[PDB]
Design a protein around this ligand. Sequence first.
Ligand SMILES: CCOC(=O)CNC(=O)N(Cc1ccc(N)cc1)CC1CC1
Length: 165
Amino acid sequence: MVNPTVFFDIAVDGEPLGRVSFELFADKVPKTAENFRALSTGEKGFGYKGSCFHRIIPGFMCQGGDFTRHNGTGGKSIYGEKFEDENFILKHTGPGILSMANAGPNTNGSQFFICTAKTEWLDGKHVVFGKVKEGMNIVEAMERFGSRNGKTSKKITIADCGQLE
Ligand SMILES: CCOC(=O)CNC(=O)N(Cc1ccc(N)cc1)CC1CC1
C-alpha cells in the first residue's frame, strides 16, 4: 500500500552536507521504484552507496547513479543491464522530480537525475518515479558545486543511503 521512502546522506569532498529523502511512486511505477529502492539499500550486493553525482547543471538537474564507471557511461539495474520504460504517467513538473536517465527507448539502468527546474521537454522520454520529500535545501547546496557543462568543482557523493520507515 504505502510508497517507500529512501535517503541519501550527501558529502562534499568527504565532508557531510546533509540528507535528502525521497518518496518513490511505487503505486504508479512499481518496477522503476523497486530498482531505485533496492539500489539504495544495496540488498542485491551492489547499488548507490559511495557513488557520485557526476553531472550537475545548475538550473537544470543533478545526475548520479553510475556505480560501475563513475562518469556517466555505466550502471546497471537489479533486472539486468537495462530495462524498459515502464510508463510516462508522471511528468517533470518542477524542482525535486526524480527521473531515470537513459540512452534511448527502453535503456534504463541505475542512473537517475533530480530536477532542479521544470524540464517538460523530457516528458514521455524519461520515466519519472519519485520526488524529493525532505532536504531540497541540501539539493540546492549540491547544485552550487555544478557548472554549465556539468563538471563539478568538488566531489559530490552518496556517503550513505538506505530506506526509511
Ligand atoms: C537529464 C537526463 O539526461 C540523460 O539521461 C541524457 N543521457 C545520458 O545521460 N546518457 C548517459 C547514460 C548511459 C547509460 C544509462 N543507463 C543512462 C544514461 C546517455 C548517453 C548518450 C549516450
